Amino acid sequence: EFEAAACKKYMSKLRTIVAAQSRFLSTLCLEDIYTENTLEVRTPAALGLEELFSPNGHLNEDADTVLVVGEAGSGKSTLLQQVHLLWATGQDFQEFLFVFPFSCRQLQCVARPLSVMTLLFEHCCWPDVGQQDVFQFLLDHPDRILLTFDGFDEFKFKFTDHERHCSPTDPTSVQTLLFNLLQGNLLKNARKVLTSRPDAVSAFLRKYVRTEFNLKGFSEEGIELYLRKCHREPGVADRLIHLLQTTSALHGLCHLPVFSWMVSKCHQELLLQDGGSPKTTTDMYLLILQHFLRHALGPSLLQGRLPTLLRLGQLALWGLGMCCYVFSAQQLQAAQVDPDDISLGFLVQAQGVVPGSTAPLEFLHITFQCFLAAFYLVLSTDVPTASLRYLFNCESTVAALLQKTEPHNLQITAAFLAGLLSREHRDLLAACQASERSLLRRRACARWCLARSLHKHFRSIAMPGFLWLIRSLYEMQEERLAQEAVRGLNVEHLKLTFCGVGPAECAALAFVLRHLRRPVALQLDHNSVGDIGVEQLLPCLGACKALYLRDNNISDRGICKLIEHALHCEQLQKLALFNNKLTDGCAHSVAQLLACKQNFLALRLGNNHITAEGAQVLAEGLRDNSSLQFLGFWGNKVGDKGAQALAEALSDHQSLKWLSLVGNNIGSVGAQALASMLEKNVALEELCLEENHLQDAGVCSLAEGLKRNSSLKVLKLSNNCITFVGAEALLQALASNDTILEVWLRGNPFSPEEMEALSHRDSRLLL
Amino acid sequence: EFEAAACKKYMSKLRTIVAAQSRFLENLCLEDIYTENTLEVRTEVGSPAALGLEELFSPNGHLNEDADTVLVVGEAGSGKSTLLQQVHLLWATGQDFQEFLFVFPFSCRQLQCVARPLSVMTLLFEHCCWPDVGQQDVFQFLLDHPDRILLTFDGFDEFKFKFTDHERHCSPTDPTSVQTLLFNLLQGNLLKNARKVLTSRPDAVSAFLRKYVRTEFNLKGFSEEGIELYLRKCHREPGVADRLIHLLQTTSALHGLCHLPVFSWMVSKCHQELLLQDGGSPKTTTDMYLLILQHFLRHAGPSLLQGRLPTLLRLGQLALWGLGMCCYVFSAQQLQAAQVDPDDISLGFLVQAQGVVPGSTAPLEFLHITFQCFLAAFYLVLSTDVPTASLRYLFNCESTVAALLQKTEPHNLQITAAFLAGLLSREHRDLLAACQASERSLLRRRACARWCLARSLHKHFRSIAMPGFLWLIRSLYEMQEERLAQEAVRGLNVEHLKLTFCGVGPAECAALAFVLRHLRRPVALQLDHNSVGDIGVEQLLPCLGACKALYLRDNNISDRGICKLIEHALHCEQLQKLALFNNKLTDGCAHSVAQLLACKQNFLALRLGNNHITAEGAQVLAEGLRDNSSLQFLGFWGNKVGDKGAQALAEALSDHQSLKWLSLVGNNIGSVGAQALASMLEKNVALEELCLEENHLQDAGVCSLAEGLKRNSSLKVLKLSNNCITFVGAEALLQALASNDTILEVWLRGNPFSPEEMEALSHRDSRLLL
Ligand SMILES: Nc1ncnc2c1ncn2[C@@H]1O[C@H](COP(=O)(O)OP(=O)(O)O)[C@@H](O)[C@H]1O
Ligand SMILES: Nc1ncnc2c1ncn2[C@@H]1O[C@H](COP(=O)(O)OP(=O)(O)O)[C@@H](O)[C@H]1O
């Protein structure tokens, strides 16, 4: 009664506040700006925001802990802000009566020990009325509670922290408090959404996560939407979109929302188009720096506010080394940042829902904290050059802080440091030095470390940290240095799978890998390279003997652009494109590759959307090829008519050893065409024909061609609706054939008795 | 003698009964209610031509036994059952179709339920009407004069045929299955040359069946005028009709739904509630069926629904069982099994078969097939006996529920699915909130439906049809979730959307707007040969911004429509082309067309052929045409701008920088216009093609045209077929063309040339095309 009123009063308060805090950006109105983000669930299937607790079509209270993982600036904080807003405005996730948003970096700073009660009430929302009754309700209905913990990487746990605790009201450390939330010891079956950077997700943490999502940023289409949403003024969006389509390196950076935001903020400067456009990450953060400086001259401009920038950078560096990303009034006075420093706009009020007033401050984004720390490291006279060794591995307070800084922060900071010591950025910073050779003294140290950086790496064997060293070399923009770093590295296979490689990472890889002496087998499977990342990679393609681009969201436009350049690459021989968005549209380009390039060896094209129409177009070039060995179509649908055109081209073909047509919806019209091939063909050693409607009629004409064959060794026929007559028609033919090593008839309709008698009749038949 | 008397006695009985069964829908009398329905015949020259009810066996001006099987096709609630009832009544009362001595009406869903095998004799006599006298003689007469027999089979989709059914059978008296019986009726094995009218939904069996049909009609529903008539016929009470008609004119979405008679009926039934207003008016289909639900519940809000929940669930269960067993009529024994008491029946969703007398132990059926689909959806949403995996089977993406849904006919399954979506809308979920077992029960179902619907359009295009696409658009609409419509179109790179002959009306337009406005890349929307009309234009306006082109051929659009279209089109940067060939436009639109040309600086194409634009309007639009500097194509094929109109256009185009193509075919243009057009050609540097066929240009016209052509050097194609040009105007042209190096083709087909003159002309210049 009173109790009910009390809760109903609380639910209103909680909504009103959560709504208020979530409606606008720390960086216009969220409802009008939120552009949808490529959200993937790990299997790796895509899905929308609203399906966060129903990825596979049903609300499952089972997966009580959900984990969203993504790079810095991928849009995790913003994704939660939308969820909160959808909920607080009654639009979605209404299965929850209460949602409690938390900022882990803020909870990290809490000195005292706390209970579940003081967590919700003192660090989120305090019930105006009937506090004890409301808490009872929450304990009695935990399954109606969502908790969100933004930036889970910014906690620091301890073995002390890892202990059991079951009381809602008994105080304890914050860290052990979550441990027990995730354990289900507290608020069992309440839902928990955690966002994190990639390197902080753990062994003992992933032990608890029932569902894991990956936030991969804006798609190429997504970028345009964002810019159209942000720039309503007549035709301004159109000119930016045109600019990006004609400035590949920049267009690539924009896949990460934080960079799309920066381009929008800096449009005016960019549209002028004088001179050049930014291409590196440091380029962009320097542009945004100057945009800000204008509002509150070029190098003169920077010099104008140098004391401010140094004081912020000092705070920022202290922060990184103390794993502290939020700052209190007392700490700002200590760091001695006046309100002219704050007003510049790199420090913004902490965005968190916490009771009343008043909120501590934090950097506009974690990466601005890393950037300004790098800025300070470059220019402050308090920073000894010998301490920059700790940024790249190769003593003092500065060195002390860098040792204690989290690696993922340290890496960002290092890449910026490199970038700021580039030839051009050193001219820009020239007015801010103290000594006319001050920036050169620092470069001397950085360049030196970076030269040994890749040799140092491989000589202690991981691959995430390698990618960051490639990025630093890129940022510095020194070509002779990239040359020095790969000099002598005898690298054959480069494994970079699940490394979060996008276009901007591709740009850096091209910059460095093109100087490789011995040609490399580059493996980028399971990333988000895309069509733009292909364009960025092209400079190093000459240094590739193989290119593996599985699961990379590459389309016809990408592969055609790839093949265009691939034709002039003598080294390049293999090319895997399994599980992308290719269609018949690429078939003409693939035909050229096969026709013209006499060096080629392998070409896996499975799990795209190639049909009978395209199969024919490509088979034309396949006839004129005389080098190819492997060819894959697993999961396409070339069917009877496509199967036929390939078979006809391959009967004469001198080199092809392996061929997959699994799941291509092929009947006995194709089986016959393939039977003709086998009679003539002397090269083909393996033929995968699983998951097709070949039938007894198909297998029989296939066994017929096999009597005239003496090259084929492995013929895989699993799951074709083959019965014990097609099985025999095959066996009879095989009694004569002395060349065949294996024949698969797994998962087919046969009586066990039938199975008995096939296993005996010929000893090469499998299940 | 006795035989003749016997037949005559039968013909009377059959008439009397068929009349009796057909006179009422009861307070209502058919003769007083039947409002005429837009009936179209399919022609290979397709658009399809319109016609009246009475021309069902004479669509183009003559009777014919030749087409013994006629097929009327229409959407659910288009008015097919009612159309046959009128035919039967016209016949039985001696008014029309008197070429038939006997008419035998049948309900396919009822014949589907007959257990025993039957002969042609027991079909007509036992399941239609039994001859009081001389049964054997009467049957003989029927076998001897089959060409005087009409058979009507209402709701042909509700049969279920089999391979076993498809076998030969020639005896009239030997029993057999009902299904093989119709196979042989259609094949002509039985009662050869007897007439057969079949009504059906659009996607029911059509292969063997279409092989058999000679004439096919389409029933497209009430016109805008038709709706008013119906409401005036239904509401005689003082000024009540006037207030509903006003309500519809000021509530577009609803007014659009009413084009389908079943919705006009619902609005009439629910007028009292609608007139009260207060709550916003319904706009989706599920809105309407929920309103009619509450109307019924009142007589026997969420509290209201909760009151009779057990009833509604028992009906829905019956309904779902019915759909999955392809059974749409229910016997006393089956109702007791399904356990619907008389409180359930009395509610009013169950009704007697049309022929049957009230309250006899007669089987029952749902008020309409769509109410069976609606209540099935209702049950699917709320019953605790129903699993969410079952809902997956609604959209494609185990248990006895899943089993039934697999066996349900697709066309029924689609309706049911759209309702399901609708009932899980934000608002309708509040309304249903009182009826849930579990406070998160409706949300668990939405989670499944929303998920399937998100992938539904991607799933569709990735297996290539267009009828089933339109149903998915409708489900997304019904659910009324904007972020979902956004999700569904995400990543669909669609350029050209072909939706011709898809039966697209206003309510379909409403749904298309709702979804297509979220397209990222602008689309070429093609709705040629539908019934969009003026209301459908109004409903489409939200997605117009996402169109680069709009094609609205043969859509019965008037001045009111196009003016409303142009009003919004002016603020659409993407929209560039706009085809309106074969509609009801007149000079009245000319002012609006002038604005479009004047103001919209990036327009490209504007086809306006086969309307009723005259000289008067041609002048009004030419004003804006002068201030246009982007247009490329412009068409008037089949209008009548004539000499005065031709002149005003020519004058405006002489200065015009962009226009490449111009058609003035069949515009009744003489040599006064030809001269004005000659002046144009001298000056004009842009125009590359000029179509002037089917006009009275004459030798005098061609000569002044050849004169202007001497000064011209841009024009490439000049089409002059069928202008009564003789071998002097032909020469006057040729002389001029000896100098002109720019012209590629010149058409003089079908002209009064003698063959000798022809040979010479063909020979003199390669370019003249004869
Ligand atoms: N879905 C989105 N729509 C629009 N802008 C976004 C989106 N996600 C991120 N951004 C932009 O990028 C900036 C940083 O994103 P953020 O969510 O802080 O990334 P993270 O927290 O994962 O580092 C935001 O200020 C916002 O402007
Ligand atoms: N021509 C018409 N005139 C008046 N009312 C009609 C007409 N056609 C249909 N209706 C109304 O709509 C209802 C449904 O029509 P019906 O013929 O059953 O559609 P169908 O059989 O095509 O599904 C009828 O009961 C009637 O009230």
Author numbering:
A (entry chain A): 193 to 219, 226 to 241, 253 to 505, 515 to 612, 636 to 702, 715 to 1020
B (entry chain C): 193 to 217, 224 to 244, 252 to 505, 516 to 612, 636 to 702, 715 to 1020
Q: What's the publication's text?
A:
We also generated a construct in which we deleted the loop regions encoded in residues 245–251 and 626–635, in addition to the removal of the CARD (OcNOD2ΔCARDΔloop), because residues 245–251 are not conserved in zebrafish NOD2 and residues 626–635 are susceptible to proteolytic cleavage during purification. We crystallized OcNOD2ΔCARDΔloop in two forms (form 1 and form 2) under different crystallization conditions and determined the crystal structures at 2.3 Å (form 1) and 3.3 Å (form 2) resolutions. The asymmetric unit of the form 1 and form 2 crystals contained one and two NOD2 molecules, respectively. The structures of the NOD2 molecules in these crystals were essentially the same, with root mean squared deviations (r.m.s.d.) between 0.4 and 1.1 Å. Since we observed no noticeable differences among these three crystal structures, we refer, hereafter, to the structure of OcNOD2ΔCARDΔloop in the form 2 crystal unless otherwise noted. The crystal structure showed that ADP-bound NOD2 folded into a hook-shaped structure with dimensions of ∼70 × 80 × 40 Å, consisting of a NOD domain (residues 195–744) and a LRR domain (residues 745–1,020). The NOD domain can be further divided into the nucleotide-binding domain (NBD, residues 195–425), helical domain 1 (HD1, residues 426–485), the winged-helix domain (WHD, residues 486–602) and helical domain 2 (HD2, residues 603–743), similar to other NOD domains with known structures. The LRR domain of NOD2 consisted of ten LRR units and formed a typical horseshoe-like structure in a single curvature, with α-helices forming the convex surface and β-strands in the concave faces. ADP embedded at the centre of the NOD domain bridged the NBD and HD1, and bound to the WHD, allowing the subdomains to be closely packed. As the resulting structure of NOD2 folded into a compact tertiary arrangement, we concluded that the crystal structure of OcNOD2ΔCARD is that of a closed and inactive conformation.
NOD2, also known as NLRC2 or CARD15, belongs to the NLRC subfamily of NLRs. NOD2 possesses two tandem CARDs that function as an effector domain and is activated by muramyl dipeptide (MDP), a bacterial cell wall fragment. On activation by MDP, NOD2 is believed to undergo self-oligomerization via the central NOD domain, providing a scaffold for recruiting RIPK2 (receptor-interacting serine–threonine kinase 2) through CARD–CARD interactions. Here, we determined the crystal structure of the inactive ADP-bound form of NOD2, and revealed that ADP-bound NOD2 is maintained in an auto-inhibited/closed form through ADP-mediated and inner domain interactions of the NOD domain.
